[PDB]
Amino acid sequence: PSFDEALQRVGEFGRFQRRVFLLLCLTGVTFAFLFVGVVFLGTQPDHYWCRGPSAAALAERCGWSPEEEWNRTGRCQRYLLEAANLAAFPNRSAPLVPCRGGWRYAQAHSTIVSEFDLVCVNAWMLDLTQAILNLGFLTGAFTLGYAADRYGRIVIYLLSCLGVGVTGVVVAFAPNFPVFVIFRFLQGVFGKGTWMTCYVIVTEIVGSKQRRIVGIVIQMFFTLGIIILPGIAYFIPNWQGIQLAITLPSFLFLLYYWVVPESPRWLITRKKGDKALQILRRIAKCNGVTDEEVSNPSFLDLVRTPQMRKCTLILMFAWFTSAVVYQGLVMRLGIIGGNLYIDFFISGVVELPGALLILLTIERLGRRLPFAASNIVAGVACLVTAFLPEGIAWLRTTVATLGRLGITMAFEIVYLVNSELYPTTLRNFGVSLCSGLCDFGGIIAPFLLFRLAAVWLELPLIIFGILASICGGLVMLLPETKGIALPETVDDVEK
């Protein structure tokens, strides 16, 4: 309780904590860049085709542009002039033959598809990048939680920032596909640590009050990164340029070092004490206990107390359900506006009003009610999209978008309440352990969607709606985490 009085004497919001807030929100923006920017990596080429050695030789000796070459001849099989022994075919009597390799591309924009030749039979492994990135997210969460709890928050934050920067530079200059995949897996490993660590530190540094502003505003910065990603993607077209621009700000964030102290409350576990008091004194620019050391956290110790176990299980299931429901709704949406950049910009922009509603609502009504309402709205939208007369009304897309907004609002509220729920020691371990489960949902979603859609078109939507509708009990079983600051050690289970 003296720590609460310590923050009362100096803290809450000052100039220092505001500057730290903006500085870490920058890292949130960069993590948002990393999480989605693959959709602008390897955008599908307008035309792709394969040519034989004779066709390539004659094309080079005549020097025509790829556009007319594709026009006269994307297809995965090509005619062969070798069998024949300005049109090459007089009457297309030459048979067509499938090609194992040698295909080229026509569009001038640079994509990972052009460099790594991910088309035809290799078009399978374009989503392999998705799976590997999400698996890297999962494993990086799982291990970096323990890494950041064993050491301090700031050291692991800085190390993860350096790792993200260097692995991104390596990926930008990957010579072959296996190197690209391995180092992008590693980038996903390190990328998960930065976001979780920055969220936990910015939650710890502020007191019990105005913590909801902290969480919701950093989520708004994540959404801002999503919104602004089309800007850089459109302005600089080259793949290498886009990845370089995404990854270099990690070094600038690595420049922090002495700017941001790790956490007073992290060190108040009688690990250091004197360093904590020094940090508090350094905080107080404007104005002039003892317990058993948890030390290394244990995964089994993460689930040992019935209330602790209940919180862990409900949080994990909510994460997984949100992931699968969001994937289903996004697949249902398709394309809006006829443009990729415009669609992405609109999708990002419409995310903000939900965040504003959350920011204005959490204090008055708590946190359980808006979260339950968001999940219920998502489930009802899923069911309504499933059952309606053949989609003869323009309300399919509106209902799907409304459900997506509801599930994103739930995604934002859960990421905060997850942070408050866990103890101080287990905080960065328990958090990102559930994000591991949402990453697992992300990897498993396409297979489940295809399998269920094989049986019936609207079965996945029905299942997702039921999963979302379970929230009525799922989140009602939570303790509302209102005005109780952040629980210390095993005092999480008092409620």
Residue numbers in the entry: 2 to 74, 88 to 99, 114 to 316, 328 to 534
Extract from the study:
We obtained a 3D reconstruction of OCT3 (apo-state) at 3.2 Å resolution and completed the model by combining the experimentally determined structure with an in silico model generated by AlphaFold (detailed in Materials and Methods). The structure features a prominent, partially resolved density of the extended extracellular loop 1 or ectodomain (ECD), which is adjacent to the outward-open translocation pathway. The structure of OCT3 features various negatively charged residues lining the substrate translocation pathway: D155, E232, D382, E390, E451, E459 and D478. The outward-open state of the lipid-reconstituted OCT3 is surrounded by several lipid densities. The protein structure features a V-shaped lateral opening at the interface between the two halves of the protein (“V-site”). Several conserved lipid densities are present at this site, indicating the margins of the lipid bilayer. We presently cannot unambiguously assign the identity of the lipids in this region (brain polar lipids, which include cholesterol and phospholipids, were used for nanodisc reconstitution). This V-site may serve as an access pathway for hydrophobic molecules that diffuse into the OCT3 translocation pathway. In apo OCT3, this network is very dynamic, as R212 cannot establish all interactions simultaneously.
Organic cation transporters (OCTs) facilitate the translocation of catecholamines, drugs and xenobiotics across the plasma membrane in various tissues throughout the human body. Organic cation transporter 3 (OCT3, SLC22A3) was identified as a corticosterone-sensitive catecholamine transporter in 1998 and belongs to the SLC22 family of the major facilitator superfamily (MFS) of transporters. OCT3 plays a key role in low-affinity, high-capacity uptake of monoamines in most tissues including heart, brain and liver.
